[PDB]
Amino acid sequence: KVFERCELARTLKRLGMDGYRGISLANWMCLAKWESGYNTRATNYNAGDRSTDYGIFQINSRYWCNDGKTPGAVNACHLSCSALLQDNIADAVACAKRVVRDPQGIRAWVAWRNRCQNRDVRQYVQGCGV
């Protein structure tokens, strides 16, 4: 599915994302916006290293989920990458939390550095009741 902005914001808040390991909801919204345009079914093959990015946060198969087809991969979220293509984003959210338990935190996503870091991201949650 493609989420509407405020629906997603409320969905993530219910799933405990607000302030998770120091990360505001608006940072998570900005990440989802630039990764996928709020689209849970998005996939992107990386020809360069044989991995794929999955779902609303574009979580990468090399480290985070298993797709069977990425060489030398591990599966730190202990999920099929299929779980990251559901309309229900609970698994994706669990896996995004796992990503940010690592030292880099939200910096793991380069899109976050480019489009969100050191920016005014308040617009992402304006009006959403979160």
Smallest separation (angstroms) from Cl ion to the CB of 48: 26
Rg of the chain on CA atoms, in Å: 14
Question: Which one is catalytic: 4, 18, 35, 102?
Answer: 35
Q: By CB under 5 A, tell whether 87 contacts Cl ion.
A: yes
CB of 1 to Cl ion, least distance (A): 8
Sign of CA dihedral 32, 108, 110, 46: negative
Cβ proximity to Cl ion: between 50 and 117 the closer is 117
Smallest separation (angstroms) from Cl ion to the CB of 83: 4
Applying CB under 5 A, does 83 fall inside the site for Cl ion?
Answer: yes
State how far the Cα of 8 lies from the Cα of 99, in Å rounded to an integer: 20
Q: How many residues belong to the site for Cl ion (CB under 5 A)?
A: 7
Helices (H), 17-102: 25-36, 90-100
Q: Does the CA dihedral 72-77-82-84 come out positive or negative?
A: negative
Binding residues for Cl ion, rule: CB under 5 A, are 24, 79-80, 83, 86-88
